[PDB]
Structure 1
Amino acid sequence: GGMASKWDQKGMDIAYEEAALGYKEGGVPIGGCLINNKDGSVLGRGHNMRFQKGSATLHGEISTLENCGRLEGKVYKDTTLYTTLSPCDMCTGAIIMYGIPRCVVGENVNFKSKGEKYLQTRGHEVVVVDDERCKKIMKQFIDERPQDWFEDIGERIELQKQQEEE
């Protein structure tokens, strides 16, 4: 939105602060926030809680939504969800279920799912910022903790295939 996009620097800066905090906490460094496009108010902010809470569902986007609390359905229809990393299929589904019209993404180089396109197929706007702070922190985690990263995205580790590929 010409007016909604005005909040994009604010939103990605908060999302990165959440990612960096999650990193410090030993977690997956993915952060988010939800902003009311009408007035730039931050409805909530969060980061991935898999390590901090032993959680299979609290991706950064899900944790962000959880932290906004229960809201009337109409509220979400004029918000932007900021996520430091392009959303997986689960977080994509959350944006779709709530009718959040815009998803602003820090980077899609370290990870992208079919959800990035599916959002747009389903009528939601996606903007990729290519934020190098997000890319660096996520790349460090993926490089150092691939077993934990594959867990977070539900990917079966197929070492026989990887040994043949390399």
Structure 2
Amino acid sequence: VTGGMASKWDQKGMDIAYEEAALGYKEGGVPIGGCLINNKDGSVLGRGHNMRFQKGSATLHGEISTLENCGRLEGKVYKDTTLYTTLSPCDMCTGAIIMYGIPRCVVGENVNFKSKGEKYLQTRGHEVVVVDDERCKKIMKQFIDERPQDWFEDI
């Protein structure tokens, strides 16, 4: 575990992110999932997965889909949340975290994918905890085993 320490809702958050990745996988998309949790009370504001294949979407990464599914929120709500993602965030999803002032991002794995985003979050004073979750590494591997041209065309 790099980038910080686990906190009390991190098992719940990563479990939901993984469930969303597994749902996306079963739909025929890239298994990338997320959810946004209130750090105070553990409430789930929203959950989502990557909709690139499901909707032919350029922008609906797992983190963007998760934020879309939370709906419109007052800016102050995002300030004590953690965004859970099964996969290290790209520059756009990094940008979402910074723009909304989401203080903390918990990342399943950064072996299959890492951008300059991960470092940039730390440059901008955000917390990025990489938990190296084997369940996230395994489902991404099953997608890449089946659909390497879909994966390497995306990244």
TM-score tier (shorter)? over 0.9
May I ask how many residue pairs the two structures share in their alignment?
Answer: 152
Give the 3-state SS of the residue equivalent to 1:61 in structure 2.
Answer: helix
Kindly indicate whether the alpha-carbon contact (under 8 Å) linking 1:4 and 1:80 is maintained by their aligned counterparts in 2.
Answer: no
Q: Deviations over 1:74-99 (max 9, x none)?
A: 11011000000000111111101111
Give the 3-state SS of the residue equivalent to 2:84 in structure 1.
Answer: strand
Which aligned segments of 4 or more residues in structure 1 are displaced greater than 4 angstroms? 1-4
C-alpha spacing 1:39/1:67, structure 2 compared with 1 (3 Å): same
* Structure whose CA Rg is larger: 1
Distance 2:101 2:8 in 1: 20
Superposed CA RMSD:
1.8
Kindly indicate whether the alpha-carbon contact (under 8 Å) linking 1:4 and 1:37 is maintained by their aligned counterparts in 2.
Answer: no
Kindly indicate whether the alpha-carbon contact (under 8 Å) linking 1:84 and 1:105 is maintained by their aligned counterparts in 2.
Answer: yes
Select the structure with the greater relative contact order (CA < 8 A; seq sep ≥ 6): 2
Range with greater deviation from structure 2 (4-13 or 60-69) = 4-13
Alpha-carbon shift at residue 110 of structure 1 (Å): 0.8
Q: Deviations over 1:40-64 (max 9, x none)?
A: 0000000000111111100000000
Q: Which residue of 2 aligns with 1:141?
A: 143
Q: Deviations over 1:94-142 (max 9, x none)?
A: 1011110000000011111110010011010011111111001111212
Distance 1:3 1:40 in 2: 17
Kindly indicate whether the alpha-carbon contact (under 8 Å) linking 1:85 and 1:107 is maintained by their aligned counterparts in 2.
Answer: yes
Relative to the length of structure 1, the TM-score reads: 0.87
Alpha-carbon shift at residue 3 of structure 1 (Å): 11
C-alpha spacing 1:46/1:59, structure 2 compared with 1 (3 Å): same
C-alpha spacing 1:129/1:4, structure 2 compared with 1 (3 Å): closer
Give the 3-state SS of the residue equivalent to 1:6 in structure 2.
Answer: coil
Relative to the length of structure 2, the TM-score reads: 0.93
Distance 1:91 1:148 in 2: 20
